[PDB]
Amino acid sequence: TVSEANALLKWKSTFTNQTSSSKLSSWVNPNTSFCRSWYGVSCVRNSIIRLNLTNTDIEGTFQDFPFSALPNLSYVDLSMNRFSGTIPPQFGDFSKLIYFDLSINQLVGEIPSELGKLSNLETLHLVENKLNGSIPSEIGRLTKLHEIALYDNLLTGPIPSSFGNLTNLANLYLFINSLSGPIPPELGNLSSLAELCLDRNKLTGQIPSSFGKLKNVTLLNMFENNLTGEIPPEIGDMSALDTLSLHTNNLTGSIPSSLGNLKNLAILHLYLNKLTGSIPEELGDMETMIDLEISENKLTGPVPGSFGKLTKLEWLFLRDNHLSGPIPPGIANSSVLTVLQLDTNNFTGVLPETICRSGKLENLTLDDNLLSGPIPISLTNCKSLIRARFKGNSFSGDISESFGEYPNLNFIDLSNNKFRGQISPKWEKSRKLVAFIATDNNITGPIPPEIWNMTQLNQLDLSSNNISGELPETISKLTRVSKLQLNGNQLSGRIPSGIRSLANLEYLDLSSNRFSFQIPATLDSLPRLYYMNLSRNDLDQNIPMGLTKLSQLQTLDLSHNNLDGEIPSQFTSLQNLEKLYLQHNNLSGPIPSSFSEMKSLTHVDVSHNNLEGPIPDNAAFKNARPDALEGNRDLCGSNTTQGL
Ligand SMILES: *[C@@H]1O[C@H](CO[C@@H]2O[C@@H](C)[C@@H](O)[C@@H](O)[C@@H]2O)[C@@H](O[C@@H]2O[C@H](CO)[C@@H](O[C@@H]3O[C@H](CO)[C@@H](O)[C@H](O)[C@@H]3O)[C@H](O)[C@H]2NC(C)=O)[C@H](O)[C@H]1NC(C)=O
Ligand SMILES: *[C@@H]1O[C@H](CO)[C@@H](O[C@@H]2O[C@H](CO)[C@@H](O[C@@H]3O[C@H](CO)[C@@H](O)[C@H](O)[C@@H]3O)[C@H](O)[C@H]2NC(C)=O)[C@H](O)[C@H]1NC(C)=O
Ligand SMILES: *[C@@H]1O[C@H](CO)[C@@H](O[C@@H]2O[C@H](CO)[C@@H](O[C@@H]3O[C@H](CO)[C@@H](O)[C@H](O)[C@@H]3O)[C@H](O)[C@H]2NC(C)=O)[C@H](O)[C@H]1NC(C)=O
Ligand SMILES: *[C@@H]1O[C@H](CO[C@@H]2O[C@@H](C)[C@@H](O)[C@@H](O)[C@@H]2O)[C@@H](O[C@@H]2O[C@H](CO)[C@@H](O)[C@H](O)[C@H]2NC(C)=O)[C@H](O)[C@H]1NC(C)=O
Ligand SMILES: *[C@@H]1O[C@H](CO)[C@@H](O[C@@H]2O[C@H](CO)[C@@H](O)[C@H](O)[C@H]2NC(C)=O)[C@H](O)[C@H]1NC(C)=O
Ligand SMILES: *[C@@H]1O[C@H](CO)[C@@H](O[C@@H]2O[C@H](CO)[C@@H](O)[C@H](O)[C@H]2NC(C)=O)[C@H](O)[C@H]1NC(C)=O
Ligand SMILES: *[C@@H]1O[C@H](CO)[C@@H](O[C@@H]2O[C@H](CO)[C@@H](O)[C@H](O)[C@H]2NC(C)=O)[C@H](O)[C@H]1NC(C)=O
Ligand SMILES: *[C@@H]1O[C@H](CO)[C@@H](O)[C@H](O)[C@H]1NC(C)=O
Ligand SMILES: *[C@@H]1O[C@H](CO)[C@@H](O)[C@H](O)[C@H]1NC(C)=O
């Protein structure tokens, strides 16, 4: 003991970057107070049995640790320190050791197989180091082990089959590592196992069919491995399971119907695999299921109608599969279902009337299916909606009657459907709505002016519809819009000057419309605008000077209009202009030949204009095709179509 105190002092004397304020200040007077006042030291019969120096800012190694001098150690916690070097084999010499923790440290090298000498060890903790090499097989000798945690290391090789001999192991955590090879089937002998976490490794091979003997495992995390084969139906015999996560693997075959026998399973993660076949209707018998995610697979056929029996279902992720048939009503019938994502499948028919029956549905994704028919009325009145995506379907109906007021709506996408009718002012009640996308529908009538009062709107896409009327100057109220797409409609009259005020505008498209008269001379106040498409309109007269004061333009398309006069020399301030399309206008005069100053002009079309003179000195004019430069009155100094 005084010998133990002296030995520990010699070890302390090797620590580096220590401070006067370190808790090891109490290591004084070895002859009298080793067992009564030394921090981290506790004794029985005046001999140290417990060394607990966790989180004491110790920087050092275990090279000079006095293994020989502390024979009676049974509790060693040296975690959360700055220990470096390796774990010496002499740690296996502490024959009374029960608890061993060296976890949050900077240790390197392999685990000494001599740890298998620690026959009294019940807890082994070495997490969050840089330990490499294979896990020693002799660790399977430690039959009193209750818990092994080796996660967040650089361990390689297979899990030793000897671990099947650890009949008292409750928790096996090995997750953040590079463990390899097949999972040893002997793990099925761990009858006391409760938590098995092998996730985030490089495990290959099949899931052992012996896993069905693990009747006390509640958490089986094996996600983010390279497991192949099919999910063995024996997994359905792990009756105590509440969390089964096998996602991000290379599993194949069908989902075993035996999963329906897991009456305690609340979380099932099977996504990001290559599962095929139909979803067994028995999967509706997992009465406890909360969070069911089998998305991103190759599942086919219909979703079983028996899903109506999953009364605790909250999250259902079936996106990116090949599911077919109509969506059965039981799929949305859970009173607590808040997320129902079905997008990127082959669902047909109309939406079931059960969609928002409880008024709790929040996120609904249906993108890229073959669905049709009208919006069910419980969805029209789903006041709890937050995110609704319908893009790429054949939904039909009066858009004003099909959608109620959605006060919690954040994101809605109606793109690529057959919606008719006029945009209702009801959308202004969505005061949190940031994006409203309705491209490629049969919307008609005017844009209600309430839309411009939606100052929170970040993205507005009404493109490719049959919307008409003149845009009012109150459009300026869309303070925070950054993507504005009204192209492909029959909007008429002058472009409102008020677009000047949309300071956050980045991408503006008013092309393919019936806007007439001069482009607003005032339109020079969009410093974030990198894209402006005014093409295919009825705009006339000289190109306004204001456009040249917008700095960040990358693409500018004013083609297919009746603009006349000369191209401004004062384009020079568009040093970031890359693509410039001015074809099919009535522009005149010479190109200023200050376009040599323009660095980034690569794609330019000036065809079918009344311009004359020589092309300027920059790439796009050299790289222009005949169509790009044709149609002008007097082209080039030597009447050329290519090569000066
Ligand atoms: C397990 O890891 C050890 C330690 O590796 C060290 O720590 C890791 C976390 C990484 O940061 C490694 O980049 C780092 O080196 C490996 O042992 C180490 O091997 C290297 C080379 O194989 C040794 O470096 C040599 O050192 C001598 C002088 O001492 C030079 O002459 C050489 O040119 C070379 O620089 C290093 O000393 C050694 N460290 C030890 C033994 O503590 C070990 O190979 C690795 N095992 C695996 C990956 O299976
Ligand atoms: C070394 O000293 C530290 C702190 O002085 C000890 O930390 C304590 O460890 C126990 C577990 O042994 C912690 O209790 C646990 O609390 C959670 C809370 O939910 C509970 O669920 C567990 O069942 C367990 O009882 C305790 O909170 C923790 N205290 C602190 C301040 O971190 C450590 O046990 C000592 N180790 C040895 C070997 O002496
Ligand atoms: C600005 O918006 C207009 C739409 O209002 C965009 O027009 C599209 O431009 C391409 C060429 O750039 C068009 O031409 C050709 O169509 C034929 C047949 O489909 C095909 O052979 C060509 O490969 C090319 O696609 C295209 O039809 C046209 N679309 C429409 C609806 O008119 C224009 O591109 C936008 N400007 C910029 C810079 O993006
Ligand atoms: C294409 O433009 C020519 C050029 O006329 C321009 O008219 C002004 C707006 C201004 O830009 C002038 O500097 C230009 O000359 C049109 O030709 C003119 O047509 C009008 C008849 O409306 C006639 O009085 C003018 O004398 C013409 N000018 C010239 C130079 O010939 C032409 O009609 C336009 N073509 C189309 C299809 O719109
Ligand atoms: C600490 O270790 C020593 C030996 O490493 C133990 O001392 C032995 O105790 C037994 C019975 O108590 C004696 O028969 C031996 O002769 C002792 N050997 C020595 C070298 O002293 C001691 O009991 C241990 N103490 C604790 C609390 O474990
Ligand atoms: C297991 O599946 C993963 C899918 O994530 C495969 O990883 C992809 O492999 C291909 C190239 O072979 C590409 O799609 C990507 O480069 C990989 N990563 C992805 C998609 O994130 C992996 O190859 C599969 N292993 C097998 C089949 O043995
Ligand atoms: C449910 O929908 C909400 C709203 O769209 C999602 O949360 C938003 O996610 C975007 C990223 O695409 C963020 O920019 C927003 O800040 C998020 N908003 C909120 C309030 O969190 C949410 O991720 C969706 N959840 C599921 C499971 O689909
Ligand atoms: C002590 O800390 C400094 C600062 O982080 C570091 O550069 C040095 O390597 C550490 N060790 C020694 C022995 O100085
Ligand atoms: C498990 O223990 C038994 C006990 O005799 C032994 O025969 C067997 O080889 C052990 N398994 C491994 C993989 O070492």
Side-chain angles (χ1 to χ4, degrees):
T1 280
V2 48
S3 94
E4 296 170 338
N6 287 335
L8 268 182
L9 274 184
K10 213 279 151 185
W11 185 50
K12 190 208 161 199
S13 69
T14 87
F15 298 159
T16 61
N17 269 331
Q18 286 309 280
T19 49
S20 47
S21 59
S22 151
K23 315 180 182 172
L24 297 209
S25 330
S26 42
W27 292 24
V28 308
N29 316 124
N31 272 99
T32 63
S33 35
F34 175 60
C35 287
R36 262 70 195 112
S37 86
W38 280 34
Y39 182 93
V41 181
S42 188
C43 306
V44 163
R45 249 197 87 246
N46 196 234
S47 169
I48 179 174
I49 61 134
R50 193 189 296 279
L51 178 64
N52 195 356
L53 302 169
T54 180
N55 202 18
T56 47
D57 266 284
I58 287 164
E59 187 188 90
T61 68
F62 298 125
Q63 162 142 27
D64 291 306
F65 187 84
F67 302 97
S68 52
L70 317 180
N72 290 320
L73 279 187
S74 34
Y75 307 90
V76 171
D77 185 343
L78 304 160
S79 57
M80 208 151 333
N81 281 297
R82 259 150 31 217
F83 280 115
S84 43
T86 56
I87 303 180
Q90 295 111 283
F91 270 114
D93 293 339
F94 293 119
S95 69
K96 301 172 160 176
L97 198 61
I98 288 151
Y99 183 94
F100 189 36
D101 189 359
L102 304 178
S103 288
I104 281 85
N105 280 296
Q106 336 162 324
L107 296 169
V108 299
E110 307 196 23
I111 295 165
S113 70
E114 279 90 350
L115 289 199
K117 267 146 49 82
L118 299 174
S119 62
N120 284 311
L121 199 72
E122 302 174 3
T123 292
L124 175 53
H125 281 179
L126 305 165
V127 311
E128 298 193 6
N129 283 286
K130 281 334 199 192
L131 302 169
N132 60 4
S134 307
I135 296 167
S137 266
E138 291 83 3
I139 284 170
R141 299 188 187 208
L142 316 180
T143 45
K144 286 173 179 190
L145 269 176
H146 170 88
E147 171 168 305
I148 293 170
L150 309 174
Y151 58 80
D152 209 343
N153 275 278
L154 310 169
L155 296 169
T156 53
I159 299 168
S161 37
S162 68
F163 278 32
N165 266 324
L166 302 167
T167 69
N168 296 303
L169 198 59
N171 308 315
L172 187 45
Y173 309 134
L174 309 165
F175 29 95
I176 295 143
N177 277 295
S178 304
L179 296 176
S180 73
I183 302 175
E186 289 84 0
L187 293 202
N189 300 350
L190 301 186
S191 59
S192 302
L193 203 60
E195 290 178 8
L196 178 52
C197 306
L198 315 169
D199 56 88
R200 280 169 286 171
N201 269 281
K202 305 238 202 56
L203 292 175
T204 64
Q206 282 167 134
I207 298 158
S209 40
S210 66
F211 270 29
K213 295 190 236 130
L214 300 179
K215 301 309 219 132
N216 283 287
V217 173
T218 60
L219 162 72
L220 179 53
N221 274 345
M222 283 183 324
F223 61 85
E224 266 171 54
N225 276 280
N226 297 85
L227 296 165
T228 64
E230 71 161 23
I231 304 152
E234 293 84 338
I235 303 291
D237 264 0
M238 298 176 68
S239 319
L241 270 177
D242 81 25
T243 293
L244 176 56
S245 169
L246 303 181
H247 72 72
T248 318
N249 272 287
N250 300 90
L251 300 167
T252 53
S254 285
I255 299 176
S257 73
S258 63
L259 291 192
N261 309 352
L262 308 172
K263 298 316 165 162
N264 298 291
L265 190 72
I267 298 174
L268 174 57
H269 291 173
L270 296 188
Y271 60 85
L272 272 179
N273 273 280
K274 309 242 166 222
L275 295 177
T276 53
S278 275
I279 299 161
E281 46 153 21
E282 287 81 4
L283 263 65
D285 296 317
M286 330 180 280
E287 53 194 25
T288 313
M289 173 73 32
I290 294 161
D291 172 22
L292 162 61
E293 315 185 20
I294 58 190
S295 74
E296 276 138 301
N297 275 286
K298 324 229 83 176
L299 305 173
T300 63
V303 172
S306 77
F307 269 33
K309 298 182 183 166
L310 305 177
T311 73
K312 322 261 164 255
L313 189 69
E314 296 181 41
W315 284 10
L316 182 56
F317 287 48
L318 305 182
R319 87 161 299 273
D320 206 357
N321 275 280
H322 300 297
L323 303 171
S324 332
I327 289 158
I331 203 178
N333 206 28
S334 158
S335 311
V336 293
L337 176 75
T338 62
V339 170
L340 173 64
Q341 81 167 210
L342 307 165
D343 64 276
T344 323
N345 267 281
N346 232 41
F347 291 114
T348 52
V350 307
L351 290 172
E353 303 295 317
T354 48
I355 280 295
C356 198
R357 191 195 39 76
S358 70
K360 301 284 169 161
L361 183 58
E362 286 181 2
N363 297 31
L364 170 75
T365 88
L366 306 157
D367 280 8
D368 305 315
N369 282 276
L370 306 168
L371 299 155
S372 56
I375 291 330
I377 166 159
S378 76
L379 186 57
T380 307
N381 308 127
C382 187
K383 294 260 190 150
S384 49
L385 256 192
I386 295 174
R387 178 175 270 238
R389 312 209 335 233
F390 311 85
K391 184 172 92 205
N393 274 289
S394 279
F395 291 116
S396 51
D398 191 353
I399 205 191
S400 311
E401 316 292 340
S402 284
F403 300 96
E405 302 187 0
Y406 300 110
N408 304 305
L409 203 53
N410 174 257
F411 184 93
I412 183 138
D413 194 3
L414 311 172
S415 300
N416 311 120
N417 283 276
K418 309 213 262 232
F419 285 112
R420 44 159 163 121
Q422 299 169 345
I423 296 170
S424 159
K426 283 187 281 173
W427 296 109
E428 202 228 341
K429 307 308 155 210
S430 293
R431 275 138 212 288
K432 303 191 208 153
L433 179 88
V434 309
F436 182 90
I437 313 170
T439 308
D440 200 19
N441 280 282
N442 179 43
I443 297 160
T444 60
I447 294 158
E450 291 85 350
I451 295 298
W452 320 122
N453 254 3
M454 306 170 72
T455 177
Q456 209 42 55
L457 220 34
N458 216 254
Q459 182 179 341
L460 171 59
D461 188 359
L462 309 171
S463 72
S464 282
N465 283 273
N466 269 319
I467 279 147
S468 52
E470 291 185 17
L471 289 175
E473 292 293 328
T474 54
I475 197 163
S476 51
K477 298 172 160 194
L478 283 188
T479 325
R480 311 189 231 288
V481 63
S482 83
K483 204 185 190 181
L484 175 59
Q485 290 178 97
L486 306 174
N487 50 295
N489 290 274
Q490 285 175 265
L491 292 165
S492 39
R494 291 187 88 274
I495 296 173
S497 311
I499 299 192
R500 214 192 138 188
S501 316
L502 312 199
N504 286 259
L505 241 186
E506 282 168 37
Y507 183 106
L508 172 65
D509 191 354
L510 301 164
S511 64
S512 288
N513 267 293
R514 293 183 185 285
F515 295 119
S516 297
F517 299 110
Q518 62 268 5
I519 300 179
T522 77
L523 216 164
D524 49 26
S525 320
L526 311 189
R528 260 172 272 205
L529 204 88
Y530 74 86
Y531 180 101
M532 187 197 265
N533 196 351
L534 308 189
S535 84
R536 297 114 208 290
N537 271 283
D538 199 65
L539 310 163
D540 54 44
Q541 280 168 55
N542 285 69
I543 285 174
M545 278 288 262
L547 272 48
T548 76
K549 301 200 234 180
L550 312 153
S551 335
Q552 217 82 352
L553 290 290
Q554 168 179 317
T555 316
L556 172 75
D557 192 347
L558 297 162
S559 67
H560 285 72
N561 272 282
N562 203 51
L563 312 164
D564 59 20
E566 291 151 2
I567 301 186
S569 35
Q570 321 65 56
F571 259 43
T572 45
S573 327
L574 267 79
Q575 297 287 347
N576 211 337
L577 185 48
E578 294 181 59
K579 301 173 154 242
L580 165 63
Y581 299 74
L582 297 161
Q583 78 257 27
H584 279 246
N585 282 310
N586 194 355
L587 298 129
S588 324
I591 301 166
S593 74
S594 292
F595 282 24
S596 63
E597 236 286 337
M598 311 222 162
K599 301 307 170 202
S600 318
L601 194 64
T602 81
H603 289 109
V604 78
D605 195 333
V606 298
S607 44
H608 292 53
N609 288 269
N610 233 325
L611 306 124
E612 91 213 70
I615 72 92
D617 214 338
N618 193 338
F621 298 102
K622 331 168 169 171
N623 322 61
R625 307 190 169 195
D627 42 12
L629 290 211
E630 57 167 329
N632 272 282
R633 158 152 281 222
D634 191 30
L635 39 147
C636 185
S638 37
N639 319 46
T640 37
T641 299
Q642 53 57 53
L644 171 44

